[PDB]
Design a protein around this ligand. Sequence first.
Ligand code: NUL
Ligand code: NUL
Ligand code: CO
Ligand code: CO
Lengths: 380, 380
Amino acid sequence: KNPKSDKFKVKRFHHIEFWCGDATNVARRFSWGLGMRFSAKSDLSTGNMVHASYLLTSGDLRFLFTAPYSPSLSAGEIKPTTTASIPSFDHGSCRSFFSSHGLGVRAVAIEVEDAESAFSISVANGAIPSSPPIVLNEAVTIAEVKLYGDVVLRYVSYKAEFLPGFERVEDASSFPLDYGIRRLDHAVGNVPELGPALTYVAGFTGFHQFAEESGLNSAVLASNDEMVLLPINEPVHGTKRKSQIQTYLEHNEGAGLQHLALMSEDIFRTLREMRKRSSIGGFDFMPSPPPTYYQNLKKRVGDVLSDDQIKECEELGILVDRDDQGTLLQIFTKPLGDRPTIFIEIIQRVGCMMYQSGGCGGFGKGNFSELFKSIEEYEK
Amino acid sequence: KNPKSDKFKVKRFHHIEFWCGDATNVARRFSWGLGMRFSAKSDLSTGNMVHASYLLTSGDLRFLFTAPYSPSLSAGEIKPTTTASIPSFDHGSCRSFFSSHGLGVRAVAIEVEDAESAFSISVANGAIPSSPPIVLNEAVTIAEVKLYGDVVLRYVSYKAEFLPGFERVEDASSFPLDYGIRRLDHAVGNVPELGPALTYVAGFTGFHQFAEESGLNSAVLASNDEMVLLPINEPVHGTKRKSQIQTYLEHNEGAGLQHLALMSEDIFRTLREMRKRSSIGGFDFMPSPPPTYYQNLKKRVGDVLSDDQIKECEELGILVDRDDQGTLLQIFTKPLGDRPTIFIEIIQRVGCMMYQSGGCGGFGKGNFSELFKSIEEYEK
Ligand SMILES: COc1nc2c(C)cccc2cc1[C@@H](O)[C@@H]1[C@H](O)C=CC(C)(C)[C@H]1O
Ligand SMILES: COc1nc2c(C)cccc2cc1[C@@H](O)[C@@H]1[C@H](O)C=CC(C)(C)[C@H]1O
Ligand SMILES: [Co+2]
Ligand SMILES: [Co+2]
């Protein structure tokens, strides 16, 4: 059931912002590893004396990478006279975030109808304010509330090109890379306590639960059309293998974003291209499942995927799960940076055609059971 | 004249260490951009709970990238029980360095006969101690003294594989990239006052001056065989174009390493390979000189380089200067990170054959005069 209880009008995921120590090197690594093009910048060359911000795009997916300059460059400025293009930015907050958590997601940004109203309604319903609504060049409104840990939910609304003050990148510095990624499908947080996290976030958004022995409990919050999807995990203690969620919390110094799932229009091309680059600056992937996993896959997805399509899944290490409505292809990268914290999922969904409805095929919860039996079966 | 006055036995440049916020992303970007292979690691997977350190190599060139983990991982350790592989590392120093200066060189490391003796003699002759000699696994001794700013001169000596505690990287994660770079030729510092800087460094090393209207004064310190070369620059104030050295000092928050010059065994291959990757994760280069520069080049290097070889220089944007002993091919990257501070020079030297003697062809001081006239000549 979908009660459609959003307390304000939400559209889609808009961008993800990483807080970095050096935005240039992270953005260049991510561009090559994921096939995202350099699209916009706000930095010294655009008159921003406060922070360096580089925007990568692939389809509708927008990754923003931001790092602080020396505060001495802007020591004469006050907020009314700032040259920062993102008015919520703060040198101390950014350095404190990065020293505490390492490289990771600071903001999950969603486009809304009216960011000022979304902020006001959110705070009236329990949201902890992080940055009040600010109107940029009479054109864009941005506001921020706390989501979990030091991650914020960022509201952006447009009266009618990323943000005022950002410049489009010259075509010479913008190479048209594209490995098939098209949008953010979901963004997953790890928290110490799931109950209070859900009550808080669902409390101020009106997002509803989307609904579906390995170390975690989880639930998924969704917007009215279920295109903004926010799974949240908590650890369960007292197993044998210590909770991977607990390990995250330790290395991250608390709650934060665990993974970003990026939808591909052709997951086989995406994974061919990404795997070609793993050892030459790109991203590494988890160990592939045993051959038993794919032998058992014909028995479960033999009617959605041909034997050849299943063979291509085994070449690339792709996992397959199936709902009662749709089928999900997925795979996970190794951690994106030094710490065993954030990583990326690549996904593609097949089914639930009406456009495709959000969450089609679920999130792969069944692949845990299937993987455990594959481990047992391959040992034999 | 070379007085050969080294106060201790110096061999060659050994490695350069960058202090980073995320070593993984910088190392992967540098690997792809420069054609350096992943060679060794010290991190969580090797039992290091303190810092992540990744070593890239190309020929004899060694770049080390290091970032701190959460101090909470090692909160129970003391220096006698540390899991750090580089005992001079300190979480607070590293975070303070990176917050102050951004991404940049922390250590210029030279191999010496006896690092404990080199340290002792250095400090007896004015060097400010940074990290006392420490013997690692009865095999390697490392010690550090201040060089300029927050950059240290690191002494390493071997009784007889990078450092104890580092593991060789598995061949699957180690792709054999190579664009032709073979060693560090020189490392250049920017300081506020050249005189006191030279007196300090020459005072404690015995390094001698190597000797050769655009905003700087400089001098070059050299070891006995002139294979360790350390140019130092100061700004000169009161021009029209404000000193580029002063701009560095402002954006860097003080003295630091300005550029690393990397010798290539084939600068044309190196620049072809590096330029292919500039817009797909690699490094950008300075704007090319006007065609007048290369027209005038035949008149000055027409006897060392054929017309075709000079044409290949113009394709790749390579600069040429000539000593009374040898000829130098050189080119400069744009800054390596967010701040307009550190950058890289690629060089190749021709002449001074005996092996080749250090500094052959100089450092390109004449290319300033030639560039200024090229600007005038091309305007016409
Ligand atoms: C690390 O996350 C995963 N790992 C998997 C592994 C290691 C094997 C097979 C399937 C996996 C699926 C996921 C995830 O996408 C999430 C999680 O499992 C359950 C609910 C969420 C909504 C939070 C999912 O998104
Ligand atoms: C930014 O440095 C340079 N820029 C050049 C430009 C922009 C044009 C032509 C030649 C250049 C040469 C250099 C440098 O290698 C140094 C410097 O000029 C003089 C003495 C040192 C020993 C310190 C050199 O190494
Ligand atoms: Co997922
Ligand atoms: Co130089």
